[PDB]
Every structure is written in C-alpha cells, then in structure tokens.
Design an enzyme around this catalytic site. Structure first.
Site, mmCIF file in Angstrom:
data_model
loop_
_atom_site.group_PDB
_atom_site.id
_atom_site.type_symbol
_atom_site.label_atom_id
_atom_site.label_comp_id
_atom_site.label_asym_id
_atom_site.label_seq_id
_atom_site.Cartn_x
_atom_site.Cartn_y
_atom_site.Cartn_z
ATOM 1 N N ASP A 108 105.626 51.785 114.665
ATOM 2 C CA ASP A 108 105.446 51.094 115.936
ATOM 3 C C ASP A 108 105.500 52.026 117.144
ATOM 4 O O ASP A 108 105.890 51.641 118.246
ATOM 5 C CB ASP A 108 106.440 49.931 116.088
ATOM 6 C CG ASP A 108 107.866 50.381 116.105
ATOM 7 O OD1 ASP A 108 108.720 49.564 116.485
ATOM 8 O OD2 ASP A 108 108.130 51.538 115.734
ATOM 9 N N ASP A 156 109.201 57.552 115.494
ATOM 10 C CA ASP A 156 108.063 57.195 114.645
ATOM 11 C C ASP A 156 107.133 58.398 114.585
ATOM 12 O O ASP A 156 106.594 58.721 113.541
ATOM 13 C CB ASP A 156 107.271 56.019 115.246
ATOM 14 C CG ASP A 156 108.035 54.725 115.212
ATOM 15 O OD1 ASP A 156 107.895 53.970 114.231
ATOM 16 O OD2 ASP A 156 108.792 54.478 116.160
ATOM 17 N N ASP A 210 107.697 48.454 119.192
ATOM 18 C CA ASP A 210 108.471 49.313 120.087
ATOM 19 C C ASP A 210 107.570 50.263 120.877
ATOM 20 O O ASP A 210 107.963 51.385 121.225
ATOM 21 C CB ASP A 210 109.509 50.121 119.303
ATOM 22 C CG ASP A 210 110.659 50.587 120.173
ATOM 23 O OD1 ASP A 210 111.491 51.370 119.682
ATOM 24 O OD2 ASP A 210 110.735 50.167 121.345
ATOM 25 N N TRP A 256 112.069 50.671 126.376
ATOM 26 C CA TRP A 256 111.842 51.614 125.282
ATOM 27 C C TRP A 256 110.391 51.715 124.851
ATOM 28 O O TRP A 256 109.943 52.776 124.434
ATOM 29 C CB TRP A 256 112.647 51.239 124.038
ATOM 30 C CG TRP A 256 114.096 50.978 124.254
ATOM 31 C CD1 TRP A 256 114.862 51.383 125.306
ATOM 32 C CD2 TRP A 256 114.967 50.281 123.361
ATOM 33 N NE1 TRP A 256 116.165 50.980 125.123
ATOM 34 C CE2 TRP A 256 116.256 50.302 123.935
ATOM 35 C CE3 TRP A 256 114.782 49.643 122.125
ATOM 36 C CZ2 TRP A 256 117.365 49.706 123.315
ATOM 37 C CZ3 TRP A 256 115.879 49.051 121.506
ATOM 38 C CH2 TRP A 256 117.159 49.089 122.104
ATOM 39 N N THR A 312 108.260 52.403 109.467
ATOM 40 C CA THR A 312 109.214 52.778 110.506
ATOM 41 C C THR A 312 109.234 51.809 111.676
ATOM 42 O O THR A 312 109.944 52.024 112.676
ATOM 43 C CB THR A 312 108.949 54.183 111.031
ATOM 44 O OG1 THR A 312 107.637 54.239 111.606
ATOM 45 C CG2 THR A 312 109.050 55.197 109.899
ATOM 46 N N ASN A 348 114.199 46.554 114.054
ATOM 47 C CA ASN A 348 112.971 46.297 113.297
ATOM 48 C C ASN A 348 112.976 44.951 112.555
ATOM 49 O O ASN A 348 111.954 44.269 112.492
ATOM 50 C CB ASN A 348 112.673 47.420 112.295
ATOM 51 C CG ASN A 348 112.332 48.738 112.971
ATOM 52 O OD1 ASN A 348 111.911 48.781 114.135
ATOM 53 N ND2 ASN A 348 112.505 49.823 112.237
ATOM 54 N N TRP A 399 116.396 57.884 113.344
ATOM 55 C CA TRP A 399 116.114 56.771 112.429
ATOM 56 C C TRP A 399 114.885 56.938 111.541
ATOM 57 O O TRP A 399 115.010 57.109 110.325
ATOM 58 C CB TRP A 399 115.969 55.449 113.204
ATOM 59 C CG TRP A 399 117.085 55.103 114.174
ATOM 60 C CD1 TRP A 399 118.283 54.509 113.887
ATOM 61 C CD2 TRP A 399 117.041 55.244 115.604
ATOM 62 N NE1 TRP A 399 118.983 54.263 115.051
ATOM 63 C CE2 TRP A 399 118.241 54.701 116.118
ATOM 64 C CE3 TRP A 399 116.093 55.760 116.498
ATOM 65 C CZ2 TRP A 399 118.523 54.657 117.498
ATOM 66 C CZ3 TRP A 399 116.371 55.710 117.881
ATOM 67 C CH2 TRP A 399 117.578 55.160 118.360
ATOM 68 N N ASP A 400 113.701 56.877 112.150
ATOM 69 C CA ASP A 400 112.450 56.977 111.413
ATOM 70 C C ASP A 400 112.210 58.332 110.763
ATOM 71 O O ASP A 400 111.620 58.412 109.691
ATOM 72 C CB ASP A 400 111.262 56.642 112.333
ATOM 73 C CG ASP A 400 111.355 55.241 112.922
ATOM 74 O OD1 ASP A 400 112.074 54.391 112.356
ATOM 75 O OD2 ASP A 400 110.708 54.991 113.949
HETATM 76 N N1 AD3 Z 1 117.109 53.001 122.156
HETATM 77 C C1 AD3 Z 1 116.845 52.468 120.966
HETATM 78 N N2 AD3 Z 1 117.797 51.667 120.363
HETATM 79 C C2 AD3 Z 1 117.561 51.103 119.146
HETATM 80 C C3 AD3 Z 1 116.451 51.218 118.373
HETATM 81 C C4 AD3 Z 1 115.487 52.037 118.990
HETATM 82 C C5 AD3 Z 1 115.596 52.682 120.252
HETATM 83 N N3 AD3 Z 1 114.438 53.420 120.550
HETATM 84 C C6 AD3 Z 1 113.679 53.214 119.491
HETATM 85 N N4 AD3 Z 1 114.239 52.383 118.489
HETATM 86 C C7 AD3 Z 1 113.606 52.001 117.184
HETATM 87 O O1 AD3 Z 1 114.224 50.921 116.478
HETATM 88 C C8 AD3 Z 1 114.123 51.152 115.038
HETATM 89 C C9 AD3 Z 1 115.603 51.519 114.769
HETATM 90 O O2 AD3 Z 1 116.526 50.462 115.026
HETATM 91 C C10 AD3 Z 1 113.571 52.567 114.800
HETATM 92 O O3 AD3 Z 1 112.469 52.413 113.904
HETATM 93 C C11 AD3 Z 1 113.236 53.126 116.213
HETATM 94 O O4 AD3 Z 1 111.900 53.562 116.478
HETATM 95 CA CA CA Z 2 110.099 52.779 114.848
#
Ligand code: AD3
Ligand code: CA
Ligand code: AD3
Ligand code: CA
Lengths: 319, 322
Positions: free
Chosen positions: A10, A15, A40, A83, A137, A186, A252-253
């Site tokens: 996303d 990602d 996102d 975001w 992701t 997600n 994360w991703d």
């Molecule tokens: N500030 C943020 N907080 C939580 C999740 C976030 C974030 N910026 C991006 N994410 C996204 O949310 C998903 C992780 O919770 C990931 O795949 C990531 O891309």
């Molecule tokens: Ca993501």
C-alpha cells in the site's frame, strides 16, 4: 533458482524498502509483479513510486521489468491521511527522478495503468508454472478478493502468503478514540477481508504481526550507515526513506519481505487466527481461536535482527 | 569581492535550503558564521545538520569552515511540535553522513559546541574588518539580544539585516484558537525581540514578509528537476529537503530560501520603505507586524513583487556547485 514473488503493498515507506529488498536479491527472488493499494498511500503516488523504483533498478542492475497494477480495493477504516501522503513525497525525491529512469517509466506506463490490481494478482498467481509466494505489506483486501472469486483455483497455486499484519500476544497500534488499541492497521483497514484470508483452508500463511516487528525498530545510528554507501543509488534511496521515519516507527514491511528472501529471518509457529469484524473497540483485532478444525497461521517470532539489518545494508549495495 | 554574511536560522527545511544558497554562491557571499535557535527545530539537531552541511561543502567545493553556535534564546510562543522535528530527520540523511564529512565535523564539533549563539553573532559582526550582512530566517531574538547588549557598537557594524518574517498587507500564518490569523510565525515566536529589531534606528532592514513569500510556492514539477542533477551532492540535498515539503492547501513555500536569495542578488525583489512596529501585548494579533504612526519611526524595506523565475533558476544553478 529464484522463486516467484508478487508484492501486494500500500505504498508507505516500509512498503518501498520491502520492494527494494525483493528486487535486489535476484538470486533468491524473482519479482514477477506488484500491485499497489490506496490504503496507507494515495494509489496514484504509490503506483508511480513503484514504477520509478522499478526503472531506477532496471536501468542499473539485473532486474526484468514486471507488471504493476492499481487495486480497486476500497477501505472500511482508512489510514490517517497524514501518513498516506508519504508516497507523494517519495514521488518527488531526486534519486527517483533521474531523466533516463523516468523516461523509461513514461514509455511503459500505458501498459501498466491498464491492469486492475486484484485481477492482476489472480492472474500472476494462477497462470504461473511454478507456485507463487505473495508478500502482502498492505491490507488483505486483494488476497481475499482472489479467494472469494477463485477459491481453490487460486489458493492451490499459492506457495505461501507472507503477511505483515496483526498483533497476537502484544498490543496493537491502532489508537483512535473509538478503539481499544488491540488491533493493527493493515487488518483494521479491512477486517472482513482479513477474516477471509486467515480463515481460508488450504492456504499457507506466514504472519509478521507486531509480535515480531516490534523487535526491529528504526534507529538513527544504523540509518546513518547508509551514508557509508552514497555511491549506491539504493543506499541513497533506502537511507533517505528511513530518515523520514526515525524520530515510533518500525521496519514492519521490510522485515516481512526479508523473510521471503531468506527464512533464516525467523522461525514461525502455528496459531489458529480469527479476526474481529464487529464495530466494537477491538475491531480488526487478530485473536486465537480454538474453534474446531480452524486453519493454522504460522506466526513469526523472535526475528534475527542483526541478520536482517545486515541483509538490508548489503542489498542496498546492489546498485 | 564577496560580502561578509552570517546566517541566523532555526533549522527547518527552508532554513537549510537558505544555508546552501548562501554558502554555494562564494562569489557574492562569504559565509563567516551561523547560529541555530531552538525554534522550529530542536537546536541540537539543527546544530549538527548545520555542521554536516558545512563540512560536506568544505570537502567538495572548498567552502571555508566557519564557527557555528547554538542560541540560548527561548520562546515566548513555541512553534508547533510537528514541524520542529524535521532537523532531526535531516540528520540521518545518507548524503549528510558520508564518512569523510562526518569525520571532519566530529573533529571540529567540540570547539563549535563551545560557542554561545548570541555572543557569537555579536563577535562576528564587531570583530569584522568589513561590515556584516545578517540573514535571519528564524525568530529575531538573537539580533535583538545583540542590540540590547551592545547597541551602536553592534549595529554600526551591520551592513544590513535581511529578515524572513511578518505579514504587512496580507494575512499571517499563525492560526491558533486564541489568535486572529494576522501574525506570522517567526515574529510570533518572540514578539518583543521583533519589536526591538524593527524599531532600532541605525540598523538597515530588508523584510521578506508573507506578502512576497506567498508568491513563490513549492511545486512538484520544479522539485523533480533536481533529479536532473543527482551527480551534484547539493541537488540530492536540496531536492530531498523540498521533496519533504510537497504535501487541498497551500502548505509550504520557500520562505527562507527567497530571503537568502536576496542576500545573494538584490535583483530578487524591489523593496518599499515602511515603518514597522510589532504587537507584543497578549492580544489575538500578538506578533503582528503593523504600520506605525510614530514620528521619526525607523523605516524597514519590505520586499515586493519578487522575481520568481529568477529565484527558481538561481536555486537550481546554486545546487550544481558540488
Ligand atoms: N506511523 C505509522 N504507524 C503505524 C503503522 C504505519 C505507520 N506508517 C506506516 N504504517 C503501516 O502500517 C502497517 C503496519 O502496521 C505497515 O504495513 C506500514 O506500512
Ligand atoms: Ca504497508
Ligand atoms: N508549515 C509551516 N507553516 C508556517 C511556517 C513554517 C512551516 N514550516 C516551517 N515554517 C517556518 O516559518 C517561518 C515562515 O513563516 C520560516 O522561517 C520557516 O522556516
Ligand atoms: Ca526558519
């Protein structure tokens, strides 16, 4: 030889780092396609950054072009707009706008903007001679759409779905005045789709929930190490994206895509995963279910942090 | 011959674009010092980014090193906690962390870390054989301290003060539940220091209020053109900082960049003399820069109708200095 992989993302910063990892490990991964979801990120930006990264890499290293599709998936609970705008910023970064690279993207854009993301994922998976690993992701809306429409025809073609999402034995990261903080973004974006995927029989799912991702935070000293590699376009790209995360922010991703590249990243344990779909404070939460004969998800645990960080630094030297 | 210049900034993204503009034009400008204020940034971060940019330019285009000091100045009305964090992200950018440049900075960091921002500004201006031009892109707290502490011994040494701040014939950008939107952020951060500066006779002021900065916004097509110059470290630098500013609304402009551009070449804009006073009372328009009726009131030269194309071209060119 390398295995077939489709990236279902996303478009946020992690990602794209995940994308880099998959596309720069040509010996282990053959990236046969990608789709971007308006979760996102605003999909038009996410779509263009995907293409610009694919062209920068393609014009500088071993990397066959692959199809990129925009997913029609719509949100149930949208990400905070704050975001999402990140793909927009990336879209304007100098390293992604070198003329020769943008030039290439301009010529191949017409083809790619014709694909519909969900249908493209179904096709890439089903028509492949070998099984396809899907690295998700972003939200699970697309893998769910494929399951709902082709069932066993799709699932039997999937090597395994490596998913970034959920929170099993730790707190979530979805903190709003209407939630209790047990859900992860997600899953929360589209709970129903997540329920369809986690409860789907005959589909192998590897799950990188906050349980694993919380153990690999974005840290300034490591991020500065990309400065020792400014001669590599990818180190300028990856270091610049993580610079906008370090301040709260995890890889994360990236860690998730790292597992697809090399399983040594983490061991995975079987857990029956269900998803809360009701409009309650814990909507989108991933909980264990002891319901009779429920499908087993392989939750990643205790990730090899140094191994991952090293994999990323070295991969960012591909070009 | 270049003219002495000191950059008085507060470490936001445009402050750093301004720094590059000043330093890269060595023909017109000799940057002899800089100070960072804990305003729209967290001083320590603004400080290090300032040092890393200096060192990088030193090892790649021979920019003479210069002292960098942290201002002890504190806010009257704090900048939003959201923006201040940017000097932090820039500190981890790959381009500012090349080993050779980090080494040099780590070497000289201890001595620069010793300076007191306000005093440093006073000394650089008073000990210069030639007059010094001060480029203020942050609040006016430091020039005000110098005026208060040294008076004419200080101002007589100032060629001119080129300031980014205020809003004269247009609305401001400070929108809080308690304000009326007429004040601009740099003045609002410390109104009293601003009053001191705008009322001081014997000091020449060039003022880039929103009136002029409003006419040169940050747009994607232009920012992407820095991608045409990725072989230049400064294009990677400037292009990345502004990539972070391309957000429905107007959002970001090149406030501090336009201001420094004028120091490089006054062709940037025409100026109009206006007697400026600052609202310091805790009123809704606190921090507003207003036209005063006082007799014998010192005039400030307000920027008008800036040359936008001229500026954009100057920035793209300056970014190819290395
Ligand atoms: N500030 C943020 N907080 C939580 C999740 C976030 C974030 N910026 C991006 N994410 C996204 O949310 C998903 C992780 O919770 C990931 O795949 C990531 O891309
Ligand atoms: Ca993501
Ligand atoms: N989003 C924003 N709104 C207003 C001012 C901002 C800003 N981000 C940075 N600034 C700073 O505000 C002063 C301009 O109002 C400039 O010196 C600049 O560095
Ligand atoms: Ca500023």
């Amino acid at each position: 030889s390398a295995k077939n992989v489709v990236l279902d993302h996303d478009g946020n910063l992690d990602d794209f780092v995940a994308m880099v990892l998959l596309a720069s490990n040509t010996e282990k991964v053959r990236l046969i396609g990608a789709l971007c979801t308006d979760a996102d990120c605003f999909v038009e930006n996410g779509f263009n950054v995907t293409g610009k990264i694919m062209c920068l890499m393609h014009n500088n290293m071993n990397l066959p072009l692959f199809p990129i599709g925009k997913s029609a998936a719509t949100a149930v609970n949208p990400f905070p707009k704050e975001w999402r705008c990140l793909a927009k910023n990336m879209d304007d970064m100098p390293i992604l706008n070198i003329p020769e690279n943008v030039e290439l993207w301009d010529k191949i854009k017409a083809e790619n903007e014709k694909y519909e993301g969900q249908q493209l994922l179904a096709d890439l998976v089903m028509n492949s001679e070998e099984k396809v690993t899907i690295c998700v992701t972003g939200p699970l809306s697309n893998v769910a759409w494929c399951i709902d429409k082709y069932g066993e025809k799709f699932t039997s073609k999937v090597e395994e779905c490596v998913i970034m999402g959920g929170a099993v034995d730790v707190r979530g990261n979805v903190f709003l005045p209407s939630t209790d903080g047990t859900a992860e973004w997600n899953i929360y974006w589209d709970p129903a789709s997540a329920k369809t995927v986690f409860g789907c029989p005959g589909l192998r799912r590897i799950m990188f929930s906050l349980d694993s991702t919380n153990t690999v935070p974005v840290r300034s000293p490591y991020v500065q190490r990309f400065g020792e590699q400014t001669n590599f376009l990818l180190s300028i790209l990856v270091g610049t994206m993580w610079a906008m995360c370090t301040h709260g922010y995890y890889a994360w991703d990236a860690l998730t895509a790292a597992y697809v590249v090399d399983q040594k990243v983490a061991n995975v344990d079987p857990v029956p995963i269900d998803v809360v779909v009701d409009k309650q404070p814990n909507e989108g939460a991933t909980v264990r279910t002891d319901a009779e004969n429920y499908p087993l998800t392989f939750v990643a645990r205790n990730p090899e942090a140094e191994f991952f960080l090293d994999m990323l630094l070295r991969s960012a030297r591909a070009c």
